[PDB]
Write an enzyme that holds these catalytic residues in place. Sequence first.
Site, PDB file in Angstrom:
ATOM      1  CB  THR A  44      -0.890   0.038   1.249  1.00  0.00           C
ATOM      2  OG1 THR A  44      -1.409  -1.285   1.497  1.00  0.00           O
ATOM      3  CG2 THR A  44      -2.015   1.052   1.004  1.00  0.00           C
ATOM      4  CE1 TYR A 108     -16.059  -0.291  -5.728  1.00  0.00           C
ATOM      5  CE2 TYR A 108     -15.438  -1.703  -7.615  1.00  0.00           C
ATOM      6  CZ  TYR A 108     -16.261  -0.733  -7.064  1.00  0.00           C
ATOM      7  OH  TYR A 108     -17.271  -0.172  -7.841  1.00  0.00           O
ATOM      8  CE1 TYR A 134      -1.943  -4.419   5.208  1.00  0.00           C
ATOM      9  CE2 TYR A 134      -1.288  -4.369   2.863  1.00  0.00           C
ATOM     10  CZ  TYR A 134      -1.599  -3.715   4.021  1.00  0.00           C
ATOM     11  OH  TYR A 134      -1.548  -2.348   4.024  1.00  0.00           O
ATOM     12  NE  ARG A 139      -5.956   3.746   3.394  1.00  0.00           N
ATOM     13  CZ  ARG A 139      -4.864   4.050   2.665  1.00  0.00           C
ATOM     14  NH1 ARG A 139      -4.597   3.396   1.507  1.00  0.00           N
ATOM     15  NH2 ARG A 139      -4.020   5.006   3.111  1.00  0.00           N
ATOM     16  CE  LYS A 163       1.436  -4.016   6.341  1.00  0.00           C
ATOM     17  NZ  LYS A 163       1.601  -3.453   4.996  1.00  0.00           N
ATOM     18  CB  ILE A 204       5.057  -4.840   7.081  1.00  0.00           C
ATOM     19  CG1 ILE A 204       5.690  -6.217   6.860  1.00  0.00           C
ATOM     20  CG2 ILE A 204       5.021  -4.086   5.728  1.00  0.00           C
ATOM     21  CD1 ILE A 204       4.693  -7.237   6.123  1.00  0.00           C
TER      22      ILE A 204
HETATM   23 MG   LIG Z   1      -0.119  -6.756  -1.238  1.00  0.00          MG
END
Ligand SMILES: [Mg+2]
Lengths: 295, 296
Positions: A44, A108, A134, A139, A163, A204
């Site tokens: 990201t 989305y 992740y 988001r 993550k 991360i």
């Molecule tokens: Mg990725």
Amino acid sequence: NIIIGAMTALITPFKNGKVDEQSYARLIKRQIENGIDAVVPVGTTGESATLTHEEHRTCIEIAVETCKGTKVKVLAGAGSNATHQAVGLAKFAKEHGADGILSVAPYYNKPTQQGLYEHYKAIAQSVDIPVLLYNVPGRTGCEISTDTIIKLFRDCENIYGVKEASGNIDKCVDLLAHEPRMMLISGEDAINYPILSNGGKGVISVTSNLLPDMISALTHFALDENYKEAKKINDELYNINKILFCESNPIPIKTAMYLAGLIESLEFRLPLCSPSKENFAKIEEVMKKYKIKGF
Amino acid sequence: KNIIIGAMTALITPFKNGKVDEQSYARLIKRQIENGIDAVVPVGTTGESATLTHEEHRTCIEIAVETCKGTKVKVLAGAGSNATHQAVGLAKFAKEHGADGILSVAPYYNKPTQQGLYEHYKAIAQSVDIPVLLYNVPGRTGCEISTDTIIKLFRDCENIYGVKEASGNIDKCVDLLAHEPRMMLISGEDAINYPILSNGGKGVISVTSNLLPDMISALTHFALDENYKEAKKINDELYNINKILFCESNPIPIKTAMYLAGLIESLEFRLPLCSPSKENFAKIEEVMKKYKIKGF
Ligand SMILES: [Mg+2]
Ligand SMILES: N[C@@H](CCCC[NH3+])C(=O)O
Ligand SMILES: N[C@@H](CCCC[NH3+])C(=O)O
Ligand SMILES: [Mg+2]
Ligand SMILES: [Mg+2]
Ligand SMILES: [Mg+2]
Ligand SMILES: [Mg+2]
Ligand SMILES: [Mg+2]
Ligand SMILES: [Mg+2]
């Protein structure tokens, strides 16, 4: 077969609208020289959404090449909200020498937990390198539930952890209480120390782009159970950790890197753009309280 | 401003053997035309925009344009992207291949600021000379186009003529039309089509209309004609199906219903979408029984 420790979600510098590949390599070398254990190209923070597939691939290749001959691993960003493309990126990362992949939950389209399980199973079955899930629901619009994470970890040999960027320490307890073998990785700098002190095994980081030595030290102290020292750093970094999210990441971190003279131009790809003047000044003011390593 | 309003359908995209079933796509559109629909939206969220290739995305727009040619039904092509360069490319493609306008979802995942949203949509709007409908759906994108930003875009950019709101927020719908009554507010949430229309919204971009195009078009037309009693009656009758079509993420339930109704051949999605649970499959089937589903 894991990738843990202090890791950096690399920014992607642009020059005249193109990836500045020389700057990208230079920034990675700076991470290596300041104690970072792995780098994450094109997460990201690296503006995954607005790189072309060719640029995405080039940034993975630059990270792999820059880390050769070092102890630093490349956990390549390979996520997509289309499973066919996530598989394609995973395979690319495997074939081009990445040590593992990061793979963000589909954004989305809001897959169900069953769909997330099938998505990740397809990705993990396509390569023989480690896969780190992740979760960042703010988001993506979806969450990988604790049950789904644990099922994927137990059922897929190469899925080794997650993550978490979810502001949910309850969930971090839930994960490691029920499946203590997974590698929980902090994706939220302000709470790096709480996640690590509950048995998380790495970060991360966004902040490490700017302060790699501090995030490195925090992580290594915590992994050694030197919690007083790790907490001291986490506490010291709270102000910068929070100001780096005053606007959507990576707008503040690129602003800080530019203010620090680490990138030449404060350039984003639309729809990302410069911060407000007021935020630009807030970031500049917070930075004055930290010692920023050069090249 | 040139506008595209009225009853509109976010077309599902049927797949057959892993490819877009282009004959089925055209057939479904003709069925929308015959049941009073005013415009169709190829490759919106409901059309699995995320998992079509750029080539498939473009083919579906072309099929919509060709199938609607010579009818009064418009094509408001899905053209959104979270990368402005790709949103511009899709807008230009839609313009060059005969769409009447475009829908353009707010960037998902990368969470642009309001300034970034303004620049994103200005670039899109400047790239074409056909109408542009903004599309706000924060539960899926992670960002919100604020009322102020929508209104500025509407006022500053000739082509931007309204917004499809899928935000569960009737207060914002009042805010929008109280401060800028010239824009076209479009419902993107079927269960509340009637409240949005009765506050001066001027159309819907519907999921439910895939299955019940006659009922959604009637609801919209009653409302535009100020027959609120009759529009509310249909909105109330549709609530149960409107809600069950979101028991799992759209378009999983609507494709399930279309398959159960015999309107598509195969209950096929592109991963990461997949079939509903067996419980939800049965719930969708049960709810459908109370409605009269038009055939071909
Ligand atoms: Mg990725
Ligand atoms: N903009 C698209 C494509 C990205 C391609 C490179 N990562 C997305 O966010 O999925
Ligand atoms: N999966 C990418 C590419 C879609 C390309 C066709 N609409 C995205 O959601 O942005
Ligand atoms: Mg480039
Ligand atoms: Mg959540
Ligand atoms: Mg939080
Ligand atoms: Mg030690
Ligand atoms: Mg201690
Ligand atoms: Mg769109």
